[PDB]
Amino acid sequence: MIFVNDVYKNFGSLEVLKGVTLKVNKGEVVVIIGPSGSGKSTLLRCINLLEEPTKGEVFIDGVKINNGKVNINKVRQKVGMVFQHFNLFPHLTAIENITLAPVKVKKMNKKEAEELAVDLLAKVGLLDKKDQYPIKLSGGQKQRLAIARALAMQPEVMLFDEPTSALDPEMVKEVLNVMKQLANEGMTMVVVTHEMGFAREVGDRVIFMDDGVIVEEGTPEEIFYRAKNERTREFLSKIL
Amino acid sequence: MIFVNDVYKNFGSLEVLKGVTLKVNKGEVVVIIGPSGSGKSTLLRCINLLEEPTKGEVFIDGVKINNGKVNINKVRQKVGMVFQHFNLFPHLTAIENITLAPVKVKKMNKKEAEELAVDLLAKVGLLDKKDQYPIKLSGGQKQRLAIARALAMQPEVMLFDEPTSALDPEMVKEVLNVMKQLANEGMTMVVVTHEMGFAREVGDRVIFMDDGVIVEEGTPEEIFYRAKNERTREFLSKIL
Amino acid sequence: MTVDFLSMVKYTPLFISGLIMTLKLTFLAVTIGVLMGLFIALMKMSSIKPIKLVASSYIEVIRGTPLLVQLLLIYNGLMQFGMNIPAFTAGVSALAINSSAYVAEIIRAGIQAVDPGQNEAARSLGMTHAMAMRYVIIPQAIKNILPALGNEFIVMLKESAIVSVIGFADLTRQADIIQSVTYRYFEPYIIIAAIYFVMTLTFSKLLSLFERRL
Amino acid sequence: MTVDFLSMVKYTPLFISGLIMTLKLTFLAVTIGVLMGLFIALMKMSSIKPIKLVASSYIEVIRGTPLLVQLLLIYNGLMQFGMNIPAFTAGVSALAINSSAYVAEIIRAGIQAVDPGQNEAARSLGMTHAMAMRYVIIPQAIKNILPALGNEFIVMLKESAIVSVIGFADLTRQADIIQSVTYRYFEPYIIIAAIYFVMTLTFSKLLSLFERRLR
Ligand SMILES: Nc1ncnc2c1ncn2[C@@H]1O[C@H](COP(=O)(O)OP(=O)(O)OP(=O)(O)O)[C@@H](O)[C@H]1O
Ligand SMILES: Nc1ncnc2c1ncn2[C@@H]1O[C@H](COP(=O)(O)OP(=O)(O)OP(=O)(O)O)[C@@H](O)[C@H]1O
Secondary structure, eight states, X not given: OEEEEEEXXXXXXXXXXXXXXXXXXXXXXXXXXXXTTSSHHHHHHHHTTSSOOSEEEEEETTEESSSSOSOHHHHTTTEEEEOSSOOOOTTSOHHHHHXXXXXIIIOOOHHHHHHHHHHHHHHTTOGGGXXXXXXXXXXHXXXXXXXXXXXXXXXXXXXXXXXXXXXXGGGHHHHHHHHHHHHHTTOEEEXXXXXXXXXXXHOSEEEEEXXXXXXXXXOHHHHHHSOOOHHHHHHHHHHO | OEEEEEEEEEETTEEEEEEEEEEEOTTOEEEEEOSTTSSHHHHHHHTTTSSOOSEEEEEETTEESSSSOSOSTTTTTTEEEEOSSOOOOTTSOHHHHHHHHIIIIIOOOHHHHHHHHHHHHHHTTOGGGSSSOGGGXXXXXXXXXXXXXXXXXXXXXXXXXXXXXXXXXXXXXXXHHHHHHHHHTTOEEEEEOSOHHHXXXXXXXXXXXXXXXXXXXXXHHHHHHHOOSHHHHHHHHHHO | OOOOSGGGGGGHHHHHHHHHHHXXXXXXXHHHHHHHHHHHHHHHHOSSHHHHHHHXXXXXXXXXXXXXXXXXXXXXXXXXGTOOOOHHHHXXXXXXXXXXXXXXXXXXXXXXXXXXXXXXXXXXXXXXXXXXXXXXXXXXXXXXXHHHHHHHHHHHHXXXXXXXXXXXXXXXXXHHHHHTTTOOOHHHHHHHHHHHHHHHHHHHHHHHHHHTTO | OOOOSGGGGGGHHHHHHHHHHHHHHHXXXXXXXXXXXXXXXXXXXXXXXXXXHHHHHHHHHHHTSOHHHHHHHXXXXXXXXXXXXXXXXXXXXXXXXXXHHHHHHHHHHHHHHSOHHHHHHHHTTTOOHHHIIIIIIHHHHHHHHHHHHHHHHHHHHHHGGGGGGGTXXXXXXXXXXXXXXXXXXXXXXXHHHHHHHXXXXXXXXXXXXXXXXXX
């Protein structure tokens, strides 16, 4: 499935990813953590080619997607992405947000897409809000709606690039719950987050990144209770 | 000392403070918490008149400071304010930031003000950074430096408007530690924060605001374990 | 002599004629400048490297060059080729042209203005550059452009007073016409300036009021 | 007839002369316009209701009114009072005045531009509006203002081709002068336009280069 193979990335003189490999298989919930500038979101964004590795290759489902010889629009159909800052479409209603891509990319039946959206809206508890615009929505409502929207294209993996960090604290539980629920239903998830509770409670695998590298990785409890690396412990002491 | 007496505040149609009273006496560390829009930072800002109450009065040291018959600069000489966003002076160096107000407001001796600054810098652990400019500083270095500057005008109270909210997580301890140290030293503090740890560790009193009102208040352990009001419980439930 | 505005009252039909001339000139020059500008924009968005380079150079040239010289170049410069284009068409062409470049930059700017996040959301949901543009970005860049356009028209009005120098019967030319029979220059200008002013305010009122709606 | 630029070559001294005049006109008009605008700004900052109201009306009027009409108003409008101001002084005045309004608005915008947070830090440290302004705010607005000014001058250059119609010997006027002896308009314009272009590029380049040095 996912295979980020020894990729590097620069932004000008800025070296962000200094050789990173990440494999994730169907069903895993993989959570990536680390200090600011560690390379986390850049790694997560190489997966669906939202960034193009300065070097290295990324395969999804066994086929190389950064050789320029592949339809990336058919790739992002499989690899979902939830954004830190919600990226909802302002001019569209809740349902309209959700139903848009399926109708125009999959060519779905408008009545069918309505029930998909209404299912999903209901799933993430935004049913009463279907015809509201992405404005009368609280930040927590926003992210749940964004999540419904991504789901409506039924990806095989969901990328979460810090879905909670631009949320007032009273708003973080509800979004994290939706995320837990998805993991519990077996969704394949790669998640970049500051919320170590989530890593503990639903993480299958935890990757600690520092200075453009994976310095250590293991299970939630290995990483949170028995961390071997010094840089791993140092980071954890500051946060926990 | 501080006495905010039943103030209200509007910003146009927006009613933010709907009648709020707050007395704080010398030595207290009072922490204000609550959902976003509760009015927390506006209340905090009426204290040194960074906002003008649509109604009500604020007395500090027994004297009403919002009657327009009092020198407001000599008021803020006593009342310090730390900012969520650091609000440092970018064109000035580390020392230069600290010494500016004292030299120009108190008319301090430049040599004396220079010796004061190196003390405060060592205090907040930034001595090696004395000449550098605010931009080469980490967010954590920034907020600690901001604190040094505020102290150099030697207030009798310090106002803290979410001094940790714009900081990477690995950076929050150091700023919170400094604040705690001051608390330990008997500094009078009013603190608006998301960090309940601080209130737990050095807080004397906790204020819970909701919808422009103080809905409940007590000691840290009172509020965090035995909160009486439903809204307090509801809010705490989402965040603890 | 000395100031007399009351004497100016009889010449109203001239001013009104001048104004109506300035309006009719600008409304048409903008209208063309817009359609031209949308076209130039699309050229700079074309994958074909040649076309983008021309539209880039065209835009870079007009904007970096005086409207007056563009006026004279068309009018005077085109004579020696056996071309005698009316002052009216010269000014329209000159304006619609100067207009076109700034309109082409407003468009581009209103697109780059919509948050790069909107695009990422769209591409990351499988939508192609085409679809992303049609259903997401453009509908939002439009709300960026209309304000800057209406504001351009408002500028084109002040602009258009220059075609007076080519002998077009615009609002500015009426001062010459008037003084020829009155020997007064001052009063007819103050009136004309005041007229340009009120035209500016009014459109600016409607421009910002139409803006607060979006 | 048909295009011939090669014949224009001998007229170089004219173009060179036209340019140096365009330069002298704009440079002085701006130099004045700036100082003028700076003054207008301070007035709009006055507590005094009359002074603030006039500087606002002045600015409101010049910006919302054609440069041309301002030129003619000074030149032609002043004749009937026994005033005969040279084209040069007329063009300078028109520019320095039109310039001054956009300068007074550039300044105000460069101040409003610096983060409202900066004033707060300073005021909250005991500093008065005066002190806050001198030691914190203004030093930061300057980096906002110098760029917008230099960008204004560049605009004042294109602007100034308008004093040609008043019979001033500027770079644009050279095309009339030449054609009187050539019956050619096209070539001398394309030349003059080309010169205006190159002046633009040159200054815009140095303007951006001076920007990266401050910011
Ligand atoms: N030129 C750039 N373009 C995009 N991202 C960049 C660039 N330079 C640095 N980055 C950073 O590389 C980071 C790798 O993620 P990391 O988590 O280590 O950083 P962070 O500052 O904690 O931000 P976040 O926690 O939101 O990812 C990205 O988060 C991003 O902020
Ligand atoms: N300078 C200002 N002018 C007008 N309204 C403001 C200003 N600052 C904040 N507000 C508004 O005041 C209301 C209350 O926000 P405030 O920040 O004072 O309290 P809070 O939301 O509890 O604190 P915080 O947002 O810091 O968590 C909000 O609706 C906000 O938009």
